[PDB]
Amino acid sequence: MLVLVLGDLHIPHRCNSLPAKFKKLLVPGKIQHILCTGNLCTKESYDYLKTLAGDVHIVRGDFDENLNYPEQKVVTVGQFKIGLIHGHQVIPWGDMASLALLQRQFDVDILISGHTHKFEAFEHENKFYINPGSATGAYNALETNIIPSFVLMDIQASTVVTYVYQLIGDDVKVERIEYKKP
Amino acid sequence: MVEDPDPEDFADEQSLVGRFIHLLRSEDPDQQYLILNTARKHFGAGGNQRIRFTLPPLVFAAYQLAFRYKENSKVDDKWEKKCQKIFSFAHQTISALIKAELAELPLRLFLQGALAAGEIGFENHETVAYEFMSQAFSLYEDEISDSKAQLAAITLIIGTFERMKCFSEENHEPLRTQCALAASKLLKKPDQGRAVSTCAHLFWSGRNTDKNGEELHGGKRVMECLKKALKIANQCMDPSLQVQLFIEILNRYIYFYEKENDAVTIQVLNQLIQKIREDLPNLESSEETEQINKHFHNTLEHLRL
């Protein structure tokens, strides 16, 4: 079971499209679930996610038009209970202690969040945290060099293999991170 | 919604402006500024429905251009003057959205402008940042009434202000206490409790320019915020929601404890955990009640490790 984790597209506030090489990698048929942190800013982008899979989960970003996206969501995929929030509600933004406090409330094995525009994955107190960054490498006042990035989770069995794609220079670089639930 | 506009009606406008900005990002900064002004005029003639979509990209393009000027800081000796002009352009452009009777969007665009200005640090950037924050707070007070929208906006304001490091104490303290006041004056009690505790972070991890860029670390004032949030939580009546808020406030007390706030004592933690132990079993069994027990459980687990 492979889950696409992306967000912070900011089309068209800050960008016009995904990078050509990312569009290429993202192919219908293979993705089962999409977990999106928000800030696509347009339904056009939502329809595009729908073509890649038929189980799309999205949460409300601070600049999303649609007031019908939920503020947070818990999706259970296989054996994993996954929390999903944009991250503008987590204060200070990106802070790990703050992020963990929310894990305690949600009671989730993995917590996905966004907003910072910086890819991040890490384990803390026996729980896993993922931030896929911005799939378009959108502008962000607090970080001058933004790397387009998104995440693919592969798993069936109490184990997580997250492939992180990043557009460095003009080429895609992948990195593999493994997490197993205690 | 038949009464509401269909976004698919402005998809082309949106595609256009995105294609426009992408091609503009090739050109030289000095030209980019010119073409942005020309764009403002061209798109300004679309009227109130379309400027909603065509103008925010130009605002974001401007912030971006300002950071471009800063990286050219050694080559170009006028970069600060050009930044000044750019935030002026942003202010005007956002102000046109207000004229078109929008509030939520312009508020967020002003916050983004404040952040940007705070970071770039051109001459007079503190004044520009203060102005942008002030404009956001105006729109908050005047135009946002729905209790949900208020909570959202105030959290965004607090969150934005918390990351800013550009204000002197003489500008920082007014903003702090304006946040605290607005938070306490939200309509619903739960929203009030949450927003007030959220404010604690401003007294702690907020940075002014007086301490050489160090955090305020005002542990005393943190306690006062959480004390206020607790008072608000007692006045709640709904038993589930009250116990929820106790747990939330506790985790916030812990947060500042483990960040080495000396004003958070183990006594205070103990009083609040004890209160929760008592009230928690008196809840009606449900999905929601299991979730509250689990949250408390998780909090206690964390206290041990």
Side-chain angles (χ1 to χ4, degrees), chain A, chain B residues 1-304:
Chain A
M1 262 158 331
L2 52 150
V3 188
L4 182 60
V5 176
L6 84 177
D8 286 307
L9 280 65
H10 293 268
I11 296 160
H13 290 182
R14 305 179 197 190
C15 301
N16 66 300
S17 80
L18 292 157
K21 289 202 179 191
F22 282 9
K23 254 162 169 162
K24 188 169 190 302
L25 274 39
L26 271 46
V27 152
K30 336 160 295 157
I31 309 294
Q32 273 83 71
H33 305 252
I34 292 178
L35 305 186
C36 181
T37 53
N39 274 351
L40 359 110
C41 301
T42 174
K43 225 237 341 171
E44 206 169 11
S45 311
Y46 181 85
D47 299 336
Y48 168 75
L49 298 174
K50 292 286 256 93
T51 66
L52 299 177
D55 191 50
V56 175
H57 300 280
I58 187 165
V59 294
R60 204 186 304 134
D62 58 310
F63 276 95
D64 274 309
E65 295 172 2
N66 194 316
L67 271 77
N68 295 115
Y69 299 145
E71 189 93 358
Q72 60 262 287
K73 197 155 201 189
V74 178
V75 182
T76 80
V77 179
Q79 278 196 248
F80 277 100
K81 200 180 152 193
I82 312 178
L84 177 63
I85 198 168
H86 178 254
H88 60 275
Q89 320 85 330
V90 177
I91 290 141
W93 298 339
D95 182 287
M96 180 185 58
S98 291
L99 278 161
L101 172 158
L102 198 75
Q103 188 281 316
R104 296 196 298 253
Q105 194 182 293
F106 284 17
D107 185 61
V108 285
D109 307 297
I110 314 170
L111 179 60
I112 296 173
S113 68
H115 194 51
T116 66
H117 294 200
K118 223 115 72 165
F119 155 85
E120 216 160 305
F122 65 86
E123 192 193 346
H124 170 92
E125 286 180 33
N126 297 310
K127 303 292 173 169
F128 200 40
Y129 294 77
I130 305 174
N131 181 339
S134 160
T136 62
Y139 160 77
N140 182 292
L142 297 178
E143 184 44 68
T144 51
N145 289 340
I146 302 289
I147 301 151
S149 81
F150 72 84
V151 152
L152 261 160
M153 300 194 299
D154 176 349
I155 31 58
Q156 275 221 355
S158 291
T159 190
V160 203
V161 187
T162 59
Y163 308 81
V164 45
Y165 295 77
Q166 300 174 106
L167 193 71
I168 312 271
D170 290 2
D171 316 296
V172 179
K173 306 282 142 54
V174 190
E175 193 204 5
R176 184 203 203 265
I177 312 287
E178 167 187 358
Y179 167 85
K180 184 166 75 165
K181 65 84 210 169
Chain B
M1 216 78 165
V2 176
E3 47 267 71
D4 297 335
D6 165 38
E8 296 189 311
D9 278 318
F10 309 101
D12 296 332
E13 313 281 327
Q14 282 182 314
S15 269
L16 186 74
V17 177
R19 212 192 76 118
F20 164 70
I21 292 302
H22 172 255
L23 290 178
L24 186 268
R25 207 145 47 198
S26 72
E27 311 329 352
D28 302 350
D30 285 7
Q31 299 307 109
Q32 287 197 49
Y33 176 80
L34 251 38
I35 295 182
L36 281 179
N37 273 89
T38 304
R40 196 230 273 113
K41 182 168 201 195
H42 176 295
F43 284 128
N48 289 6
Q49 286 208 74
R50 303 150 93 120
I51 65 157
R52 177 159 223 186
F53 310 105
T54 61
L55 258 48
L58 303 183
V59 175
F60 276 117
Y63 299 157
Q64 214 149 343
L65 183 56
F67 281 96
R68 250 279 213 157
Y69 280 133
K70 189 192 187 179
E71 53 158 267
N72 290 181
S73 142
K74 249 296 100 188
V75 185
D76 177 359
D77 61 299
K78 282 156 189 157
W79 73 271
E80 295 179 272
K81 210 70 184 169
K82 290 171 177 179
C83 284
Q84 291 174 351
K85 193 169 49 178
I86 269 167
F87 282 92
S88 171
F89 171 82
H91 188 309
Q92 295 179 76
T93 309
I94 300 156
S95 288
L97 297 174
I98 303 174
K99 198 270 178 205
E101 297 177 42
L102 299 179
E104 296 271 41
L105 176 49
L107 184 146
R108 285 156 164 81
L109 285 175
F110 268 130
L111 286 177
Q112 281 296 299
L115 260 185
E119 292 292 292
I120 294 170
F122 59 90
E123 170 70 8
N124 203 244
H125 69 285
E126 175 165 6
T127 284
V128 171
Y130 195 88
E131 170 64 22
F132 271 69
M133 290 295 307
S134 165
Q135 291 286 347
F137 247 125
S138 301
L139 287 161
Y140 175 78
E141 289 171 346
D142 307 343
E143 296 289 357
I144 302 174
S145 65
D146 165 59
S147 78
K148 275 168 178 158
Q150 290 200 312
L151 176 57
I154 194 63
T155 65
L156 210 45
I157 291 179
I158 288 164
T160 297
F161 174 42
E162 183 283 328
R163 298 283 68 210
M164 297 178 72
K165 37 162 181 171
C166 70
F167 295 115
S168 66
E169 179 60 18
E170 62 158 50
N171 289 308
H172 198 100
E173 178 274 338
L175 284 161
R176 268 198 270 99
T177 88
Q178 205 74 1
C179 291
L181 274 170
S184 79
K185 294 293 166 199
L186 293 168
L187 300 330
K188 299 178 190 171
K189 284 288 179 197
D191 303 359
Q192 253 172 59
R194 292 180 173 132
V196 176
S197 44
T198 290
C199 271
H201 292 294
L202 296 170
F203 296 94
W204 184 254
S205 54
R207 285 167 274 126
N208 59 8
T209 54
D210 287 10
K211 282 184 173 195
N212 304 294
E214 281 302 350
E215 293 178 338
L216 273 169
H217 274 21
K220 59 293 212 173
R221 287 104 90 196
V222 169
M223 296 296 294
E224 299 165 60
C225 296
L226 301 175
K227 195 177 158 191
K228 290 293 159 199
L230 264 170
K231 201 173 64 161
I232 291 172
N234 287 121
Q235 301 171 343
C236 273
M237 257 53 222
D238 180 346
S240 269
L241 197 45
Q242 170 176 256
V243 169
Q244 200 132 47
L245 291 168
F246 285 158
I247 301 160
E248 296 182 347
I249 293 157
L250 174 62
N251 287 265
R252 190 100 36 160
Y253 264 121
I254 298 158
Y255 175 101
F256 294 104
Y257 181 79
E258 295 168 344
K259 294 275 181 175
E260 299 203 299
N261 188 8
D262 281 47
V264 185
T265 69
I266 203 99
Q267 282 66 55
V268 168
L269 271 43
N270 280 330
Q271 289 172 354
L272 185 39
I273 64 97
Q274 184 45 25
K275 194 150 178 64
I276 298 169
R277 290 191 177 293
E278 298 162 0
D279 292 359
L280 182 54
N282 303 354
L283 293 179
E284 318 300 315
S285 289
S286 65
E287 170 179 44
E288 192 210 357
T289 308
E290 180 171 303
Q291 288 168 3
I292 299 170
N293 281 275
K294 221 172 202 85
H295 178 195
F296 186 51
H297 181 272
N298 291 342
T299 314
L300 292 172
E301 218 84 18
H302 171 96
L303 272 181
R304 300 157 52 266

